[PDB]
Subunit: 227 residues, 3 copies
């Protein structure tokens, strides 16, 4: 078993034989229920893009837990110079860790790392296809709709986290299209409600996406499911 907790915005916590957190935007995440000290012992940290609402508190969390950060080469290079343990990958590349397999997926976005007020190159934005004990979790990251998502149809993803808030990411209508592409067994909506710019009709999403035979599990920040 494993307990997958959604902590608001794009934050996803996987508790299993190892503890993995994706896009640990915790401090300054208005809709996140916990502080940094509310997190359990963290073994791995997955970062999809350099943006603050994704990179977030990775630097601190990594150091306090002696955790290792998995992201693209440009983001890891940055983190490395902050004295942070990393495992560099890049888009479409997989690797088998002690806990399972992690694959960086394509995504449409900017991966700019904001340092002070200078925009540093942080490679290209990604998602994550995580295979743990046969189960498969897809974290899309911040992304628009892309045809590269159709590649995941044969993976038979169990739980997929998709953005729905629009403006910066897929809106509700597009996120449904994305779910038909991926055809996961279950979908969880993310990137919404954090600000007013990305308010979304999460009820409508669940309705439309279940017409397409995909179960929608609307997790409020703090709620979770298991695999």
């Amino acid at each position: 078993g494993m307990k997958v907790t959604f902590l608001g915005h794009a934050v996803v916590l996987i508790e299993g034989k190892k503890n993995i957190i994706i896009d640990p935007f915790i401090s300054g995440n208005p809709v996140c229920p916990v502080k940094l000290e509310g997190l359990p012992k963290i073994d791995y940290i997955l970062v999809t893009a350099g943006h603050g609402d994704h990179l977030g508190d990775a630097v601190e969390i990594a150091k306090k837990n002696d955790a290792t950060v998995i992201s693209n080469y440009e983001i890891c290079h940055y983190l490395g110079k902050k004295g942070v343990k990393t495992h560099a990958m890049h888009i479409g590349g997989s690797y088998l860790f002690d806990f399972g397999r992690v694959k960086m997926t394509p995504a449409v976005h900017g991966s700019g790392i904001l340092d002070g007020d200078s925009m540093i190159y942080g490679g290209n934005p990604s998602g994550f296809l995580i295979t743990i004990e046969g189960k498969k979790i897809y974290h899309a990251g911040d992304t628009g709709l892309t045809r590269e998502m159709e590649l995941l149809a044969e993976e038979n993803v169990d739980v997929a986290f998709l953005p729905i808030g629009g403006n910066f990411v897929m809106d509700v209508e597009d996120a449904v299209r994305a779910a038909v592409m991926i055809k996961p067994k279950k979908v969880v909506p993310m990137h919404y409600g954090t600000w007013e710019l990305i308010f979304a009709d999460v009820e409508l999403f669940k309705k439309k996406v279940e017409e397409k035979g995909v179960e929608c599990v609307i997790l409020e920040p703090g709620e979770s499911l298991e695999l």
Copy 2:
């Protein structure tokens, strides 16, 4: 209705209930029929990439008109520090403005901003899918042929602006392919003849693209069409 004017290179001016200019490359544009002072009152500025031939005179125009620039997060960040009103979005993300809906489409290109002789990160390049009064304008920006363009097929675009210059963008041959993928009501070729590096056979493009059943409207810099 509305008046869509092509001002050379990738510059497209939409005159409706509000005024919008896409990729305002005015000063320095050898084929642009107008000076900066020629432009009517600008309400919004759409910037597809951080490049000079797209960003262009955005900062000046923005300030003179108290206009808001719509672009990706990284470009809007750089613009903000130059004291410019911005509405940030990113690839595949749409939003509803007072004049209509704007959506950043994917594009295969670079988005470097040239501030000094330093090359700054400007996120990832895009196009724009603009929905005004039930009409849809697709502005591809600078881009090669991409499969993401097929996502636009079902939009039933009214006018599509595609590059044909080659070298930095699609050549005539690939731009025909893009036109068939999108199947718009009409296609207008852009990014050609600005330099001798991109002196392309615009007449041949028209012939070839119309053999595929896609009406072409060749617009000389300064000419326009209505919706």
Copy 3:
């Protein structure tokens, strides 16, 4: 005819009426059999991405041979300030040189240029579709599996160089998917064995890709074939 030599990692040398090298990662390439002096006269240099293992010795090699580097705008701008002859292009752009035609194909990766310890923006990473005397060579570049590779299917590529190392690039399983997408005449695995992280069952690749009906040519660093 022409002699196409693989020199480890992503280094491919094309000897014909002109001499073109792709991603000249020679110094510090443990699987590259030659020193810089082992190279013939270079007329052209093809750089897919800004990464060290691709940009390689392009600056030094260019200066010695008075060669021109073919890469994207952001990369060519950098090399320009190093006093290096460049012909800038970008993704999807083709151009006809004296030796033949070069097109920058899409690729899913990063393209950061590492100056000292600064990660400079080097645009977006690419592949290359080179056509010399009716022959077609696809150098994928460093990349994951993307649907953009299906745009190459109708080219009837004679020889395609695809990465199989995993982690940073496609693994063996995904590279076979990419090969069926492209459907070329021959396929040559690259980006493997250079480090411990990217050891890959090269033999298994050949077996599996030829099961799908695409002849595989395992070239070891220094081996070559003809067209």
